[PDB]
Structure 1
Amino acid sequence: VKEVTQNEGTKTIANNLTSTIQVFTDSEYQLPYVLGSAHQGCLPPFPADVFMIPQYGYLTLNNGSQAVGRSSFYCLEYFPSQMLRTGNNFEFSYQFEDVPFHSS
């Protein structure tokens, strides 16, 4: 985790060793599931590329630009998440439900 500041025109970057990040996996499927729309931001094809993580957003019922009464608003901080500092790591496992072989 790195802090970056601006003094006039110069830039400088430095470790912040106490800083954290927050990671949860939505395993109850309680959020708008936005994967599968073929958006950019996947891991690069080539293992030597460094990639920028895409921003999360979601769409809800509308009428015009206005919102209707069924429109949901989700606050992602309202889930349990795991806070990781520079020494910490994260893991989870997942098991696919039975699916027909892709017929190639």
Structure 2
Amino acid sequence: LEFQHLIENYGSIAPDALTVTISEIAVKDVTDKTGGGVQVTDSTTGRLCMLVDHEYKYPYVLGQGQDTLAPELPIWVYFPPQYAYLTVGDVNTQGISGDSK
């Protein structure tokens, strides 16, 4: 609906500002449940590490068309992607095979 309203009522769009808030953090301990399975409890000593890379120190992997986005519906839990990146290196011939790494 809001996108319909945007394109019905405005001549142009540009990005202006962004705020990301992480809230309601729960680091949850897991342990064995009575009768099998596991049970979960909230941890007062568990910590979530948050690193915001304002300096762009770390290889930027966002904006590559990858299947990593937040869920399209608000009823779905985001499972954020594992951070991994590609770097330059030297091509070494794998012995007699002529295959390369």
Q: Taking structure 2 as the reference length, what is the TM-score of the superposition? A: 0.54
Q: What do residues 27-73 of structure 1 show as CA deviations (whole Å, max 9, x unaligned)?
A: 1111100111111221111111112111001111133479xxxxxxx
Q: Which protein has the larger Cα radius of gyration, Structure 1 or Structure 2?
A: 2
Structure 1 residue ranges without an equivalent (≥5): 67-104
Normalized per residue, which structure has more strand? 2
Counting helix residues as a fraction of each chain, which structure ranks higher? 2
Provide the alpha-carbon RMSD of the alignment: 2.4
- Distance change >3 Å, CA 65–CA 4, structure 1 → 2: farther
- Structure 2 counterpart of 1:56, which letter? Y
State the percentage of identical aligned residues.
35
Runs of 4 or more off by more than 2 Å in structure 1?
Answer: 5-10, 62-66
Structure 2, unaligned stretches of length 5 or more?
Answer: 1-26, 94-101
Q: Which has the higher contact order (CA 8 A, sep 6+)?
A: 1
Q: Deviations over 1:55-102 (max 9, x none)?
A: 001111133479xxxxxxxxxxxxxxxxxxxxxxxxxxxxxxxxxxxx
Match of 1:5 among 22, 31, 36: 31
1:60 aligns with 2:76: no
Query: Is the 1:41–1:51 contact (alpha carbons within 8 Å) kept by the matching residues of 2?
Result: no
Name the TM-score, length of structure 1 as normaliser: 0.53
Taking a change above 3 Å as real, the CA distance of residues 65 and 25 of structure 1, as seen in their structure-2 partners, is farther
Provide, for residues 12-40 of structure 1, a one-character-per-residue CA deviation record: whole Å limited to 9, x for no partner.
21111222111121111111001111112
Change (3 A) 1:65 1:48: farther
